[PDB]
Every structure is written in C-alpha cells, then in structure tokens.
Amino acid sequence: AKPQPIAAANWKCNGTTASIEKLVQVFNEHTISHDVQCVVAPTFVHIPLVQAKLRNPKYVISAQNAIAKSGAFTGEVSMPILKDIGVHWVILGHSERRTYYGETDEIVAQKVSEACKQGFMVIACIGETLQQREANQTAKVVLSQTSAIAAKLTKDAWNQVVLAYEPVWAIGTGKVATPEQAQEVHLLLRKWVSENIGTDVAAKLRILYGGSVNAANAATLYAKPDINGFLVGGASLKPEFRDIIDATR
Amino acid sequence: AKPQPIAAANWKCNGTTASIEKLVQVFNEHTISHDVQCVVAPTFVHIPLVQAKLRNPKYVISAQNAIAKSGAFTGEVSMPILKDIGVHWVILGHSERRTYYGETDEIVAQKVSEACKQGFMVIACIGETLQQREANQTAKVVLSQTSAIAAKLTKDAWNQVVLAYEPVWAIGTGKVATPEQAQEVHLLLRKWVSENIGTDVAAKLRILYGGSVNAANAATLYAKPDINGFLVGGASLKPEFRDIIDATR
Ligand SMILES: *C[C@@H](O)COP(=O)(O)O
Numbered sequence: 001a002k003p004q005p006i007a008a009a010n011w012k013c014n015g016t017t018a019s020i021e022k023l024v025q026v027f028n029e030h031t032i033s034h035d036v037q038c039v040v041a042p043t044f045v046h047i048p049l050v051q052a053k054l055r056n057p058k059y060v061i062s063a064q065n066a067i068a069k070s071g072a073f074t075g076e077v078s079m080p081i082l083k084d085i086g087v088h089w090v091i092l093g094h095s096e097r098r099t100y101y102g103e104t105d106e107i108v109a110q111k112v113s114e115a116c117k118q119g120f121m122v123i124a125c126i127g128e129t130l131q132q133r134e135a136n137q138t139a140k141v142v143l144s145q146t147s148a149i150a151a152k153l154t155k156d157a158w159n160q161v162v163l164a165y166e167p168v169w170a171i172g173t174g175k176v177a178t179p180e181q182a183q184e185v186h187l188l189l190r191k192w193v194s195e196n197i198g199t200d201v202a203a204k205l206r207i208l209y210g211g212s213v214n215a216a217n218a219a220t221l222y223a224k225p226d227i228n229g230f231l232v233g234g235a236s237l238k239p240e241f242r243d244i245i246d247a248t249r
Numbered sequence: 250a251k252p253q254p255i256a257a258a259n260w261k262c263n264g265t266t267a268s269i270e271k272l273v274q275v276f277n278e279h280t281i282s283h284d285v286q287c288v289v290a291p292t293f294v295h296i297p298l299v300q301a302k303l304r305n306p307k308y309v310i311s312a313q314n315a316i317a318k319s320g321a322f323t324g325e326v327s328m329p330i331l332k333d334i335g336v337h338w339v340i341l342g343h344s345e346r347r348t349y350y351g352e353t354d355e356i357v358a359q360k361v362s363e364a365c366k367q368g369f370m371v372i373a374c375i376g377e378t379l380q381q382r383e384a385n386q387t388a389k390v391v392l393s394q395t396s397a398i399a400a401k402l403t404k405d406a407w408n409q410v411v412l413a414y415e416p417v418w419a420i421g422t423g424k425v426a427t428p429e430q431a432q433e434v435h436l437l438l439r440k441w442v443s444e445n446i447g448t449d450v451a452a453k454l455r456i457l458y459g460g461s462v463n464a465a466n467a468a469t470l471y472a473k474p475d476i477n478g479f480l481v482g483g484a485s486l487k488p489e490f491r492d493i494i495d496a497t498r
C-alpha cells in the first residue's frame with residue numbers, strides 16, 4: 001500500500017556533455033519493469049542536452065533550484081522559464097543552499113509554495129545537522145522545517161509535494177543513515193502530516209531518504225514501511241543508479 | 250586610440266524560447282560594420298538555444314554568473330562546466346548578486362581570479378550605491394572594489410578582464426548616469442589601473458558603463474574618451490539593442 005516510489009538523481013554541479021551522453025545512454029538502456037518515477041536533475045546548462053537524449057519513459061527532468069519570478073535576478077533561473085522549457089519538477093531547499101546560499105525556512109517555504117502554484121512537482125528537502133542529531137533535536141528540526149513549508153500550502157498543493165529527508169551528516173560523507181534511523185524520522189513526519197494536513201495526504205505522500213544511498217544499501221532502506229525511495233547524489237553519476245532504481249521494487 | 254568596444258546584453262532572468270528565437274533573429278539580421286565585440290548573456294537554461302540560433306559573427310555568448318569548481322553545489326553552474334559547453338565569457342559581481350546573494354568583494358575577486366585562470370573573458374561589475382554617491386564615496390568604493398579584484402590577479406590576467414562601472418542607482422531605475430558622471434569614474438579607474446597594474450594594461454582595458462543605457466543615450470556616452478561600451482539590461486531584451494551596438498561606432 002505504499003504510494004508510487006521515486007528514484008531521483010541529483011547530479012549537483014557535475015558533468016560534461018560527453019559524460020552526460022554516456023550516462024544517459026546507460027539510463028536509457030536500463031529497462032524498468034515496475035511503477036516508479038525516476039527523476040534526473042542536471043545543472044541548468046545541461047537541461048537541454050538531457051531533454052534531447054533521455055528517452056527512458058520512467059524518467060522526468062528536474063531543476064536543482066529555481067526562483068519564483070522572472071526579472072532582474074542576474075544568474076538565476078525562474079519557475080516560469082523552467083515551465084516554458086518543459087521542466088516541471090524542481091528540488092528546493094537542498095542543504096548547501098540552506099547552509100551556503102542563505103535559504104532560510106521562510107525562503108524555502110516561499111519557493112515551494114510558488115512552485116506548487118506554478119504546477120511543479122517539488123522535491124522539498126529537510127534534515128538535521130550532526131549537532132542537532134547529537135542534541136536530540138532531530139524531530140524538532142524536521143518538524144519545524146516541514147511546518148514552515150506547510151504554512152504556505154493549501155491541502156490540494158500537497159499532491160505536488162515530495163519530502164526528502166536528508167540528514168546533513170549523511171550528505172556526501174559515506175555515513176548513510178541506518179534503516180532504523182531513517183524509518184524513525186519518516187514515521188514521525190508522516191504522522192505529523194496525517195494529523196496536521198490530512199490522513200489521505202499522508203497516505204499518498206512520498207517521503208524519500210537521501211544521504212550516501214548506494215546500490216548496496218538501497219533495498220534494505222526501501223524495505224522500511226515509510227520510505228518511498230531516494231534522493232541520490234554521488235551514486236547517481238554512476239551506472240549503479242540502475243540498481244538504486246530497481247531497489248524500489 | 251580606444252580599444253575595441255564591447256556591447257553586452259545581460260538578459261537577466263528573462264525569456265521564453267519563442268521570445269529568444271525572435272530576438273536572436275533580430276540580432277542575426279543586423280549587419281554590424283565596425284569592430285565591436287557583442288556579448289549576449291542568457292539564463293543558463295537558455296544557453297543551448299542561443300548557441301543553436303545565434304549566428305552573427307560579432308557575438309559571443311556569456312554566462313551571467315558561475316562558481317569556480319564542480320562538485321556538491323546544488324543549483325550552481327561551474328566554470329569547467331561552462332568551458333566544456335563552449336561558454337568562455339562570464340559576468341561576475343553584478344550588483345544584486347553582491348546585494349541579494351552575498352557576493353562580497355572577496356567572493357567576487359576570487360571568482361574573477363578563478364575565471365581568468367580557466368581562460369574566461371570576464372565582465373567584472375563594480376559600482377556605488379545611491380547612499381555612497383551622496384556621501385561622496387564613489388571613488389573610494391569603486392577603487393576598493395577594483396583593488397580587491399586586482400589583488401588576486403597577475404598582470405597578464407588583465408588581458409582577460411573587462412570592467413563594467415554600473416552605479417547601483419542607475420540599474421533598472423530609468424535614471425542613467427550622465428556622460429560626465431560616467432566619464433569621471435572611468436577616468437579615475439583607468440588612472441588607478443595605469444599606476445597600480447600597468448600603463449599598457451590601462452590603455453587596452455575596456456571599461457564599460459551600465460545602468461539605464463538605451464539606444465537614445467548610448468552614443469553620447471560613447472563619445473566620452475574613457476567609455477568603451479556598455480553593459481545593457483532592459484534595453485538588451487528589445488530590438489533597440491541594435492542601435493546600442495551601432496552607438497559604439
Ligand atoms: C541528497 C543528496 O544530497 C545526497 O548526496 P549523496 O552524495 O548521495 O550523499
């Protein structure tokens with residue numbers, strides 16, 4: 001009775017046209033035989049290449065970030081611009097944007113709200129730091145991040161939201177969360193959604209895990225009842241993303 | 250004895266594929282009969298479209314921003330990625346990135362240095378605020394911004410630099426700097442470069458003006474001896490950019 005899983009590739013700031021062409025061919029040649037939404041999020045400048053080359057019908061293309069409106073915002077890409085070029089998925093609130101690039105809960109929440117209004121599917125990232133984990137604040141943090149986002153959404157908007165629980169200490173560090181750690185958080189998130197948003201919304205909501213997912217640990221994560229797939233960084237640059245997808249069977 | 254002028258279009262966060270196709274056709278059909286480097290800086294996601302459609306031999310394509318290195322920087326585009334896709338011009342330090350997106354003098358200077366090391370032509374933006382202007386700090390500000398950049402450059406690197414003097418109060422406000430205001434600043438910048446970098450470097454350096462340039466005011470700006478062309482925002486989205494280019498004759 002889980003909702004449809006998602007296997008999402010966050011390529012981050014990586015790729016050449018040669019490397020992308022090779023990896024997209026790998027993705028194309030991998031026949032997927034279960035119901036899963038695959039997502040690839042290239043850098044902005046690589047979106048047209050991926051749109052030209054990616055043909056696997058289980059995939060959609062996502063942006064890694066956006067701003068809400070067009071205008072005098074040198075260097076940024078807006079949601080209307082993405083929609084016009086055919087991109088209607090976006091990752092918002094990823095941790096280094098929160099950490100490095102000043103995206104507060106309020107800024108993330110506003111972005112998510114705008115994206116939903118413009119018809120995007122949104123992968124909204126939440127997660128605690130190592131300091132917060134060791135201070136026994138994990139629940140408080142992820143619920144605060146989630147409630148900030150929720151405050152700007154209507155109930156219907158949640159049909160467009162995907163949460164990605166990504167402990168900051170697991171991102172790129174080779175220190176994956178255990179299945180029990182991840183399940184604990186996904187369960188408490190889903191219960192919050194059930195009680196604060198709706199029981200229907202909670203049952204349908206995809207809550208993905210991210211942070212050092214690889215092809216060897218993914219199936220055991222996916223076996224937990226409240227884990228609906230993955231947001232994958234480093235391993236999504238490699239052919240083993242195929243087995244991460246198949247770990248959602 | 251001016252160096253080769255530049256007419257640069259900063260499209261900012263604007264465009265659809267239909268609007269871009271139409272404007273690029275206008276640019277293509279405009280025959281330019283003098284020595285000028287034209288530059289168009291689309292949003293990242295529009296770079297491939299512009300590369301596919303733009304054919305006027307006086308043009309090159311620029312990014313509106315970049316980060317120095319590839320890696321775990323969700324949402325950002327790096328200098329190596331741009332180089333690989335054929336983009337070897339970049340605008341750095343534009344005012345709302347300084348104001349809105351936390352680019353300090355140190356961050357701008359580091360970006361400019363990295364870009365030069367990677368073989369980019371760089372349009373490095375400097376300029377004072379209205380508050381700084383009214384406090385009689387214009388010179389101090391633009392020289393501080395310039396010297397910060399200079400501190401991370403070798404002499405040879407300056408062959409890749411273009412300065413864009415853009416008073417913040419003139420950006421998008423319909424309040425262009427007068428020719429005398431702009432010339433005063435360009436003269437003091439060039440003298441600083443001459444004395445601190447080299448007399449040869451100063452003679453060859455393009456110092457562009459930006460901030461509410463349009464087709465009607467451009468020629469009178471260009472007539473000033475230390476103005477080498479323009480960084481154009483709003484008017485570069487319109488067919489009248491053709492006459493801004495021709496104002497550098
Ligand atoms: C969610 C994403 O940032 C995790 O990156 P990994 O390299 O998969 O840890």
Ligand SMILES: *C[C@@H](O)COP(=O)(O)O
Pocket residue numbers: 259415419420421422459460461462480481482483484
């Ligand atoms: C340099 C650039 O920001 C100026 O924009 P305008 O719209 O031309 O004032």
